[PDB]
C-alpha cells in the first residue's frame, strides 16, 4: 500500500551534504529563535529540518548561502520534507522535537565506533554519566555544543580530530579506549 518514508541512497548523500553545510553556517552566530532547544539535540533537529526544506532564494538569503556552490536540490515528497518534524518518541508516538536520548534510541541506528567508517552528518554519541551528548562528524572536523549558550553565543564549536586529541579533557576521544564514547549513529531515515 504505502511503505515507511525514508531517503534513498542518492537523496541520503545530498541530505548529508546540506545537513553538514547548514551545521557549519551555525558556527559564526549567536542564539537563533529557530532552534527548539539551545543544545546539541536542538542543532541536529534544526540542521536536519533546514536540510529538507526547499532551498529557494528567500531561504538562501536568510541562511547566508546566496553566493555559494551548494549541494543539488532534492525532489522530495511533502512527507519526506517533514521527516525532521516527525520523530519517533517511543511506543509509536510521534512529535516534532527530540532530545539526545530519544534521537539515538528511536531515530538512529549504530554505524560503529570507527570514524574511518562514519559519513558526513553521522552523530558521535557520548555518555558522561549524568549527561549524554551528540557531536556531528562533519567529514574532516567535529561540530559540538559547549553546553552553555548566552545572548551572543549559540555555544556551537568546531574542532579537528587532531586538536580534540590534544584536549586535557580526555572524555571526548572517539576511540575504543574511551568508555564515555558509546558509538557513531546514523539518522534512521537515511539509506544504508
Curated annotation (Swiss-Prot):
Keywords: Signal. It comes from the Bacteria. The keyword DNA repair does not apply. Gene3D superfamilies: endopeptidase domain like (from Nostoc punctiforme). InterPro entries: DUF1175. To E.coli YfaT and T.maritima TM0986. This is Uncharacterized protein PA4490. The lineage of its organism: Bacteria, Pseudomonadati, Pseudomonadota, Gammaproteobacteria, Pseudomonadales.
